Ligand binder design. Structure first.
Ligand SMILES: Nc1ncnc2c1ncn2[C@@H]1O[C@H](COP(=O)(O)OP(=O)(O)OP(O)(O)=S)[C@@H](O)[C@H]1O
Ligand SMILES: [Mn+2]
Length: 268
């Protein structure tokens, strides 16, 4: 895989592999800065499907300026000994994604989890302000730096993180992001997503039919007040969940600070 492509970026160590890309720590030679480069895998690149899937999700990833949002810098596709390799250049986050944490460290401590997801609401909310719906909220798209800073990425453009309105092919709004962010919060508190199945279609059915089991019913140490917040964000009807990311944050802040949520009590 490439030592130095674009003649502008010198790719370094692999920071990690995602479902369809290797992410390198490159060095921007022109602006003299450390940067992250997400390159489509060479094996998946000789497959027009993935090539186009990456190429689409590359020019469509929103570039926003926010301390909690990963800034996109460049996009392109250089010729390498493996054909073209589409790539996206972005802010280097020294840390891991929530997925990495869930599958290595395990379930986060409630207060820390509440903080992380509260900080993600800040980014989601700012995005909503600019009229941009993320519509792809999941653990692998939310990062935590070495300085505990929350960095969210891939705005614009995942089987068990989609909203009932997404699973029905309907429209998508701020409330849709709330539901998905709620799924991330659920998993990060308990250890597993709200809904799991033997096939994507199974999970999609569970999303728009089956109710979520209270987080505390799945993991030890989770307050009932936390159930209220989580489960409200997982409400099937958009009008039942939080209307804005700020609203959800306002409620996480309360639970965090040992205050009663404005979310309907989870009873029986
Ligand atoms: N902006 C970044 N800065 C530093 N490291 C990153 C950055 N983005 C991703 N990484 C690392 O690369 C790994 C994979 O990144 P992903 O975004 O999950 O790749 P992906 O192919 O888009 O996977 P998906 O989103 O599930 S399709 C992560 O676990 C991180 O360690
Ligand atoms: Mn991705």
């Amino acid at each position: 895989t490439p030592s130095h492509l674009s003649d502008r970026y010198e790719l370094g160590e692999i920071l990690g592999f995602g479902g369809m890309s290797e992410v390198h720590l490159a060095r921007d030679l022109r602006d003299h800065r450390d940067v992250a480069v997400k390159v489509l895998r060479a094996d998946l690149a000789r497959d027009p499907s993935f090539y186009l899937r990456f190429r689409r999700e590359a020019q469509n990833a929103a570039a926003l300026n926010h301390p909690a949002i990963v800034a996109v810098y460049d996009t392109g596709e250089a010729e390498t000994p493996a054909g073209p390799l589409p790539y996206i250049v972005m802010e280097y986050v020294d840390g891991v994604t929530l997925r990495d944490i869930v599958h290595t460290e395990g379930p986060m401590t409630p207060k820390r989890a509440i903080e992380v997801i509260a900080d993600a609401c800040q980014a989601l909310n700012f995005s909503h302000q600019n009229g941009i719906i993320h519509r792809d909220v999941k653990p692998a798209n939310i990062m935590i730096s070495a300085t505990n800073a929350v960095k969210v990425m891939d705005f614009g453009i995942t089987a068990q993180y989609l909203s009932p309105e997404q699973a029905r092919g309907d429209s998508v709004d701020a409330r849709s992001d709330v539901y998905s962010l709620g799924c991330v919060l659920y998993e990060v508190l308990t250890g597993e997503p709200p809904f799991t199945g033997d096939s994507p279609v199974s999970v999609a059915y569970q999303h728009v039919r089956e109710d979520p089991i209270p987080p505390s019913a799945r993991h030890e140490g989770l307050s009932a007040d936390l159930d209220a917040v989580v489960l409200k964000a997982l409400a099937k009807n958009p009008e039942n969940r939080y209307q804005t990311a700020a609203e959800m944050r306002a409620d996480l802040v309360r639970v965090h600070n040992g205050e009663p949520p404005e979310a309907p009590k989870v009873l029986t």
